[PDB]
Amino acid sequence: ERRSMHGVLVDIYGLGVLITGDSGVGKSETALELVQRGHRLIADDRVDVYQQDEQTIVGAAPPILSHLLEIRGLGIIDVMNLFGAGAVREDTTISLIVHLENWTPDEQTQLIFDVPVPKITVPVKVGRNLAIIIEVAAMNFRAKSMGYDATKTFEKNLNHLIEHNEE
Amino acid sequence: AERRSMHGVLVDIYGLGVLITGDSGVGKSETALELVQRGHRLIADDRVDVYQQDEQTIVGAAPPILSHLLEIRGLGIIDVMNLFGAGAVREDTTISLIVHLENWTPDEQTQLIFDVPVPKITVPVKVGRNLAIIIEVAAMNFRAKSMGYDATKTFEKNLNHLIEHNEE
Amino acid sequence: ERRSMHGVLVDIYGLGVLITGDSGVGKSETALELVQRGHRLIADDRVDVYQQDEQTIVGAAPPILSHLLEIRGLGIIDVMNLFGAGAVREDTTISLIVHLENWTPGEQTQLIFDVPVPKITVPVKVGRNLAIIIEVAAMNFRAKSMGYDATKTFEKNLNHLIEHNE
Amino acid sequence: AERRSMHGVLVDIYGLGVLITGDSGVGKSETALELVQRGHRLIADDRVDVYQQDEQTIVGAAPPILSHLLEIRGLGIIDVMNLFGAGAVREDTTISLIVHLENWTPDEQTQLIFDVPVPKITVPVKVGRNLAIIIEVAAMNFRAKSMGYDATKTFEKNLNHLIEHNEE
Amino acid sequence: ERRSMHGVLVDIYGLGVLITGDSGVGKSETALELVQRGHRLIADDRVDVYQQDEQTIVGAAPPILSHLLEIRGLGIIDVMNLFGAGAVREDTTISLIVHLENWTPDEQTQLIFDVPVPKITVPVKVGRNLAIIIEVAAMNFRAKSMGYDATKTFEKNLNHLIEHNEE
Amino acid sequence: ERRSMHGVLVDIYGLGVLITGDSGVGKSETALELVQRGHRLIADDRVDVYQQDEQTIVGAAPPILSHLLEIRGLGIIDVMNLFGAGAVREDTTISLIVHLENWTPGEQTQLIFDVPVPKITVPVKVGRNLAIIIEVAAMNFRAKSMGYDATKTFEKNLNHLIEHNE
Amino acid sequence: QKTFKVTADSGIHARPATVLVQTASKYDADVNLEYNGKTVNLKSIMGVMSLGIAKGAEITISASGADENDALNALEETMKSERLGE
Amino acid sequence: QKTFKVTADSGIHARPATVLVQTASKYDADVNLEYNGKTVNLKSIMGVMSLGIAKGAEITISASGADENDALNALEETMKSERLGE
Amino acid sequence: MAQKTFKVTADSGIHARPATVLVQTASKYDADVNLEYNGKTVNLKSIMGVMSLGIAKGAEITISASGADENDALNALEETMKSERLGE
Amino acid sequence: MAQKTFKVTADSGIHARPATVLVQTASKYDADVNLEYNGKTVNLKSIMGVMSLGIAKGAEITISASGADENDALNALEETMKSERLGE
Amino acid sequence: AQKTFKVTADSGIHARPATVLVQTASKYDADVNLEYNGKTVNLKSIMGVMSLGIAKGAEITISASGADENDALNALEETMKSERLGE
Amino acid sequence: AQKTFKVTADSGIHARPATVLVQTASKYDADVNLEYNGKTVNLKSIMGVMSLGIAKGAEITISASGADENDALNALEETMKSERLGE
Numbered sequence A, E: 001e002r003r004s005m006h007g008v009l010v011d012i013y014g015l016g017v018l019i020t021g022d023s024g025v026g027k028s029e030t031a032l033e034l035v036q037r038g039h040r041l042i043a044d045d046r047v048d049v050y051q052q053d054e055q056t057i058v059g060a061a062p063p064i065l066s067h068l069l070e071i072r073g074l075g076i077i078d079v080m081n082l083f084g085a086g087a088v089r090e091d092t093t094i095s096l097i098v099h100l101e102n103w104t105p106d107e108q109t110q111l112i113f114d115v116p117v118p119k120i121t122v123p124v125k126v127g128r129n130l131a132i133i134i135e136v137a138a139m140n141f142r143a144k145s146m147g148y149d150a151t152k153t154f155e156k157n158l159n160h161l162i163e164h165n166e167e
Numbered sequence B, D: 001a002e003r004r005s006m007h008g009v010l011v012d013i014y015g016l017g018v019l020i021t022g023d024s025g026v027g028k029s030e031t032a033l034e035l036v037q038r039g040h041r042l043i044a045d046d047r048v049d050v051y052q053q054d055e056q057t058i059v060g061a062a063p064p065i066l067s068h069l070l071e072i073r074g075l076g077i078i079d080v081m082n083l084f085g086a087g088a089v090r091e092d093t094t095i096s097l098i099v100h101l102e103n104w105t106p107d108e109q110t111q112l113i114f115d116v117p118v119p120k121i122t123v124p125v126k127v128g129r130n131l132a133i134i135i136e137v138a139a140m141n142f143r144a145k146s147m148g149y150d151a152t153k154t155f156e157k158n159l160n161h162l163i164e165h166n167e168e
Numbered sequence C, F: 001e002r003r004s005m006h007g008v009l010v011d012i013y014g015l016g017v018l019i020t021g022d023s024g025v026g027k028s029e030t031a032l033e034l035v036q037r038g039h040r041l042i043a044d045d046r047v048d049v050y051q052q053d054e055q056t057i058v059g060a061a062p063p064i065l066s067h068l069l070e071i072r073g074l075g076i077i078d079v080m081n082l083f084g085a086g087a088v089r090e091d092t093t094i095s096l097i098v099h100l101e102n103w104t105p106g107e108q109t110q111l112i113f114d115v116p117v118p119k120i121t122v123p124v125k126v127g128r129n130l131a132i133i134i135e136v137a138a139m140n141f142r143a144k145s146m147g148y149d150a151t152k153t154f155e156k157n158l159n160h161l162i163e164h165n166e
Numbered sequence G, H: 001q002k003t004f005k006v007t008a009d010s011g012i013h014a015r016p017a018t019v020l021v022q023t024a025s026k027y028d029a030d031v032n033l034e035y036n037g038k039t040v041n042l043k044s045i046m047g048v049m050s051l052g053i054a055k056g057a058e059i060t061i062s063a064s065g066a067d068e069n070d071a072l073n074a075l076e077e078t079m080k081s082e083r084l085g086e
Numbered sequence I, J: 001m002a003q004k005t006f007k008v009t010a011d012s013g014i015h016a017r018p019a020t021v022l023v024q025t026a027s028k029y030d031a032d033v034n035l036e037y038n039g040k041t042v043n044l045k046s047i048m049g050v051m052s053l054g055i056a057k058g059a060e061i062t063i064s065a066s067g068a069d070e071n072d073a074l075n076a077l078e079e080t081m082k083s084e085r086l087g088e
Numbered sequence K, L: 001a002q003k004t005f006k007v008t009a010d011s012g013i014h015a016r017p018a019t020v021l022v023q024t025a026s027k028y029d030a031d032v033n034l035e036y037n038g039k040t041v042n043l044k045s046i047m048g049v050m051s052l053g054i055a056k057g058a059e060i061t062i063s064a065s066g067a068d069e070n071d072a073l074n075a076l077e078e079t080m081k082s083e084r085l086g087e
């Protein structure tokens, strides 16, 4: 059916990436920086999702919010109007979820209509450029699909090094 | 010809003179540094000498001694004209928008300069925010509204149609 | 003789720049943004250095870490695989040290292996884009080598200015 | 599963599979090289193996032996996956648009691939033209028309209003 | 008064630059590449000009052509729609004219309503990236206004070298 | 002993690349586009070279031409003044030679001052973006140094492929 | 949890949605607003306005966390204070 | 030079402007089209269509160069051929 | 519609060098030159395609051309096939 | 509304170093600290502005502050002015 | 100020164990280091720890300098056992 | 295949004269060179010519290799006089 979720849905390198996280974490601002880097904004703040298959989910923006971004201080901006067609997209299947947790010293999955969508959690902490990390998260996700898993390859190389160091 | 010195950074963003204000330590210079890299013009850093040009215009500039310079905590003084070339500076510019950087805390503005109401917006400095990007868009959006594209006014209009509608 | 140091070594504008600072400051993330801007990653987290000249230090990454970056949340990424050859470099002489100290209320050098390396300390504070400042730090360093010292020139101009007979 | 090999370069531009055709020597590879640098994906260079996926879809790919490669007159063979990384390649893509490069001379097209009418546009190769930029915009404009923004149709509509008007 | 001229008027680094040249030279395509690099399109093909002062001229696009570019092969494109507000501008005073002449082996000024506008002529020849040269022409023009004239400085340095070489 | 050569010397990805070719081919314009893309201009039109090692050649610009570019139509431009320090460099060892031959119906080297410099010849033909090809030529050259030779790898794969028992 | 009958003649638009989220935001707890099956975060204004709540609408404000109640009280206080509903 | 009375009921729009410049383009000479004081290059279509020439309009086609005449003849031939005017 | 068939004797097959000479010869004509091998056919004027076929010793290839040079191109292609001892 | 005036004795004037210590002291207070010299006045917590004034020997400067630290800040500024032998 | 251990866990100190070791250390203000065959690394950064490739039978030395200096080592040693890594 | 000249023009071979010299040379297929104090440059590229800083009394050598080899030198010599530059 159709449920609405809180977050920002952007098309990054062809992958639908849903950015979640407590209000105030700066989801919209990060999304703004992503469209400038050449990505597509699907929906800001309210993402209306519905299950297409038993393996895929689709998100979109309620018509009233289409093309809009609310940025604390500036107000509402229309990215279609400020950046053109290359900045928006009617909808997209959701491939990855990156949840922005607020950092404090003290695989993964999330279900959306009984379909487990992969998720990663990045910490919001001074000095971090969130747009860049999310962009790479998508980039890396895509690479793993193409068969290049840096982690799995490293762990393989590490075990050979350990097994070897046993002299 | 009466002049006053203001604290902030004056940059030419998309043709618009944008004066960035805010408590020392907020990082006005660093943000300005990132703006020239993105292709904008630095007019004056730290001390902006302004003078009223008429009933509706304020012009700013840098005292000769500071021309082209930026002081960045840790690095020291840098000359952007020397590191980025002519495309990074400008002798002066009329001030169109004021973007004040207030440091964020849990718990149609206008500012007066020489008896001239310059528009102003306040953006919160908070972890994860890329200040240069927001200021750049603030200018960009300001310009769009001048061209006749006001996203806010258009949305509020669309919201009333929607409400009126759901009211059956 | 190799000595291991904690930091990230990147080739910025031809200059070997060693980024140091407490774990958690975001050395890797900043390095990630630097390769995207077109710089070269030499070594992440563990930088193996060895003295060479009386004034030269060389760093590199242990083979096991070559091309890798560990980014909190994402895991391990291979920048050679995500950005290509233009993002890496086998090694580089270390010219500058940029220490990222968490913000809290002139000439300076740190000696790696008994050889003075120029160092600068930038504060990590909300709103600061670290990759941009480090990049300019290298850029400015290079300019001073070419004979353009903005500081020295300003102090000279300040002195001439201060000469206010009036 | 029937396949045929076509001569051209298949790139993923803004999500759209764009097949670049044209006489050998026109510089298909060089243009494709500039497109991956601008952030697009190379699917297949020189030999594009296509197969009809259904009544309205054509899929293309590169024979394994050519995967990731580009042959550039003078330089030789280059591996864009190795020079630009994963973001520069893609295993395959449905072909949406065909941009044929004909060499310019003083004195709603569609092309058939496996009994499927793929749209096509022809751009002239002539001194001073930046081919990568035009193809990129061709894809960009194609996409916009899909989203409902047809500049041509809108202009022709506006021209008739104008004419009708000047007719007094 | 108001006369219309053949060319493309773009706002490059704040300077109104009118690009002239025989039809077929690729004025529109070059203009297309300039908006992508971040410049503003004022008017394509037909530039309606009128004299403002005795030292300045202003150009604009007839409403019917506003925001449009006609590119051989593609047809008509709306840059406001493909690139957003940052790609257009209602009008601009014309500061520089760069005439694209077709290259063949075998200061300057042009009058527009009795005001002499500075002009430069660049040759269209294989391998030349016209957008880049025009962009630098504007860039250099601006620098000379700021007081940095590379030519005048060089000629000064050259004469000292010649006078010196006289031993 | 200095010898003057006709061409443009640019620092592309750390590699000294000497661009040669008949006057009129557009060496300067291409060089202009290369500094905008972030490369360093060493010398335009006249490149003063001098041998150093048994395998090293160094080039530079006569002081009078330092930082300058002459572009047909525009005149003389100072790239240091239009783009800043990041656009120039006092000198550089010459690693590659890219000769721009006007188009007309493998390993190769030209010896400057009695020392073999690798050379490649690219055709100037309508539609080609010369700055992009030269930039990749340097980029590819560098990759081969790092051990990634696309050609050698392909010929190997072609040979294994050609081994068609079938 | 606590429900309301919207009475504002203008519905919950621009200004009202503003004060509502402004009040909800003041609480460490989580707070939601539902209207005809749809549920948004009451701390983010875009979502609230997207619902297009009109006069006569029946909305349900819910919260989760220590603040739970104080959150509700203040939201009720604001619904009333702002003359939005009851 | 040569003048015409536009007769096309649709005026000189899309298609017509197309064949007109197509014909003019074939000549090394320069060719202009005027309508109510405004003059555009007849070799560039945007300009021609921008004039919005309607039925009953009085346009003036002029050319300069060796081709001068041949240019005019073919343009007249096309005005007639395309049933645009006379 | 001019065509010709061959049988490669190249113990090394049609690798780089032999592919090159083949296309350099096919390239001197305006005629459109094609090379088919094992069902697939490529444009004989572009080397990547030719090498992609991976033609081995004992392969049976078919060279075809269309236009003015048609016959003249095939004659030249048949001589290179001979000259370079590539087959039949 | 706390204020204080001085006369610089600094034969070297208020160049870099002396400017630095002045702002480093002004920076330890929340109070807003201002420095006026020859009509123009800058924010004493930002060094670029202070040095831009080019205060020379014999100059008459006025340091002012507003808020809680108000008086406490002026006291500290007056001691640095003394401690560093900058003037009056 | 330090503490030595001999690794007993069969599969050496790889990915998982390492994140639990560095996880722990990270919790302390003091900066702690790991020593293996003369080479030292920051025990708060995982890449370095895994780069050492500590195998079964290895003799590592954990050191800490700082206020919580001691709390650090105890915490780590506890992980050393609690996580079946060594002694 | 060459031709020598001694510069007589007072203000040496600067900007203007140089563009007229290179202007000329450029018209020939043959590639021509200018020699001053052992250093040689392409007479078809102006930057190089002016870089030499040829002054009054200088002894330059113009050479050309190519089909129009001779037409080149004559044309240049003519400019040498026609332009009051030397002999």
Ligand SMILES: [Ca+2]
Residues within 6 Å of the ligand: A027, A028, A029, A070, A071, A072
């Ligand atoms: Ca928001």
Ligand SMILES: [Ca+2]
Residues within 6 Å of the ligand: B028, B029, B030, B046, B071, B072, B073
């Ligand atoms: Ca500052």
Ligand SMILES: [Ca+2]
Residues within 6 Å of the ligand: C027, C028, C029, C045, C070, C071, C072
């Ligand atoms: Ca890290």
Ligand SMILES: [Ca+2]
Residues within 6 Å of the ligand: D028, D029, D030, D046, D071, D072, D073
């Ligand atoms: Ca090719």
Ligand SMILES: [Ca+2]
Residues within 6 Å of the ligand: E027, E028, E029, E070, E071, E072
């Ligand atoms: Ca056009």
Ligand SMILES: [Ca+2]
Residues within 6 Å of the ligand: F027, F028, F029, F045, F070, F071, F072
């Ligand atoms: Ca040149």
